[PDB]
Design an enzyme around this catalytic site. Structure first.
Site, short mmCIF file in Angstrom:
data_model
loop_
_atom_site.label_atom_id
_atom_site.label_comp_id
_atom_site.label_asym_id
_atom_site.label_seq_id
_atom_site.Cartn_x
_atom_site.Cartn_y
_atom_site.Cartn_z
N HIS A 158 0.87 -1.20 0.00
CA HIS A 158 0.00 0.00 0.00
C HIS A 158 0.89 1.23 0.00
O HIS A 158 0.36 2.33 -0.18
CB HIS A 158 -1.12 0.01 1.00
CG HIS A 158 -0.70 0.15 2.43
ND1 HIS A 158 -0.59 -0.91 3.29
CD2 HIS A 158 -0.39 1.27 3.13
CE1 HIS A 158 -0.23 -0.49 4.48
NE2 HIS A 158 -0.09 0.82 4.41
N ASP A 203 0.06 -7.62 1.70
CA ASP A 203 0.44 -6.21 1.68
C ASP A 203 1.92 -6.14 2.02
O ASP A 203 2.26 -5.75 3.15
CB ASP A 203 -0.51 -5.46 2.58
CG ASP A 203 -0.30 -3.97 2.36
OD1 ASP A 203 0.53 -3.47 1.58
OD2 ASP A 203 -1.08 -3.32 3.06
N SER A 249 3.11 2.83 8.64
CA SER A 249 2.85 1.81 7.63
C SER A 249 4.06 1.49 6.75
O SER A 249 4.81 2.34 6.27
CB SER A 249 1.72 2.18 6.67
OG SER A 249 1.00 3.30 7.16
N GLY A 250 4.16 0.19 6.53
CA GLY A 250 5.24 -0.43 5.74
C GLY A 250 6.43 -0.57 6.70
O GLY A 250 7.43 -1.16 6.32
N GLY A 274 1.27 6.55 8.70
CA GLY A 274 2.65 7.05 8.58
C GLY A 274 3.68 6.04 9.10
O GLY A 274 4.89 6.22 8.78
#
Ligand SMILES: [Ca+2]
Ligand SMILES: [Ca+2]
Lengths: 223, 223
Positions: free
Chosen positions: A40, A84, A177-178, A175
């Site tokens: 994402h 993801d 995320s990943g 923020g």
């Protein structure tokens, strides 16, 4: 990170910031030329920044490198956020050192009850938005699948794990995320999603890295 | 906008989106060449977009114009957000029409109890973040200063007004900022700030436009 604490400078050396003229996601350095993140987090052009503490200040340890190949997991399902996961091969190798180091891929899937470390420059508030300057840290346990599933009826896939507190007040947020979730020095998860942030009964969901070791390796190898 | 509703297409023609390669604030068109916004929305280069409904889709009414002069109120106080008002003279006049129209400056300060319309592409969630595509609307009353002040002990200046609900669930949020609050066809406020979003007891605070009519005029004139 909501309810976390400011990380000791350069204590999370594998922590990377996905920049696109602004910080928009985190990632983990798995080797001198590869970063693992969330699909994402895909963008056509990304600047990966390592050795960052204070994302807004040049402190002199930063290494800024363009993403060359941005490869999302082929079964990435934008609807469900299943798979993801994404790999970023840097345009050139980074100088590994003290504040620019790598993290191990999981040797096994970590058991529920394991204490992990979540990090990011993600929103720090449970309501509204506040973007921090300094990297934030969070100690949190991996919760039993049952609770995960209980929190998110029919949305948790087998490549998703919940990490956090049922009580709320402490979590990853937008923020982050990943970004990484490291347990006993191995990358066990990736900041994925959750309903709101730091809300009681709304644990954060993470991509279960141990389900992709092969994929990661195969891809890295193939590229 | 949290707890608002999707505005009838091109129903808020004075609504503008402050773009910088992404939507980051709203504003009001006060004349064919001038937009009023929040000083906290300042950037060195801004693209003002009018006639937008769906900020992510070209629907054919959009007008995109660069900001020429970006002028913050000289007493802008970043610490307190006092005088959080800015004027943007467009690089060229827009074509006023049906979906690209202006809003009147307040003739008087509106009384507490007046129903206003708040709009924006601001966060739509009370916890976490969700950015909408379509412009969002919100009907909300201007609250008595006493309640404003009560909600924000020693932070409300005389150029600040609270608008919203003490109960929560309905409010402006990040991304709505610099955006308009129109009452009986006049611009009475600008999306300013508040603690979290849509939180009970945390009304949204707005810059009281009626305190700057002179400033606005003088500046416009002088430029
Ligand atoms: Ca830095
Ligand atoms: Ca549009």
């Amino acid at each position: 990170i909501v309810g976390g604490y400011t990380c000791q400078e350069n204590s999370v050396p594998y922590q990377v910031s996905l920049n696109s003229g602004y910080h928009f996601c985190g990632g983990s350095l798995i080797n001198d030329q590869w970063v693992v993140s969330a699909a994402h987090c895909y963008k056509s052009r990304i600047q990966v920044r390592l050795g960052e503490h204070n994302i807004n200040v040049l402190e002199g340890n930063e290494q800024f490198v363009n993403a060359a190949k941005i490869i999302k997991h082929p079964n990435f399902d934008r609807k469900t956020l299943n798979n993801d996961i994404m790999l970023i091969k840097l345009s050139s190798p980074v100088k590994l050192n003290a504040r620019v180091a790598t993290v191990a891929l999981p040797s096994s899937c970590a058991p529920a009850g394991t204490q992990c470390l979540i990090s990011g420059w993600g929103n720090t508030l449970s309501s509204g938005v506040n973007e921090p300057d300094l990297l934030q840290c969070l100690d949190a346990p991996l919760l039993p699948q049952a609770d995960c599933e209980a929190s998110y009826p029919g949305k948790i896939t087998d490549n998703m794990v919940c990490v956090g507190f049922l009580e709320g007040g402490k979590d990853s947020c937008q923020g982050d995320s990943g970004g990484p979730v490291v347990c006993n020095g191995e990358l066990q998860g990736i900041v994925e999603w959750g309903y709101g942030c730091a809300l009681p009964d709304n644990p954060g969901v993470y991509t279960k890295v141990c389900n992709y070791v092969d994929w990661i390796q195969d891809t890295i190898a193939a590229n």
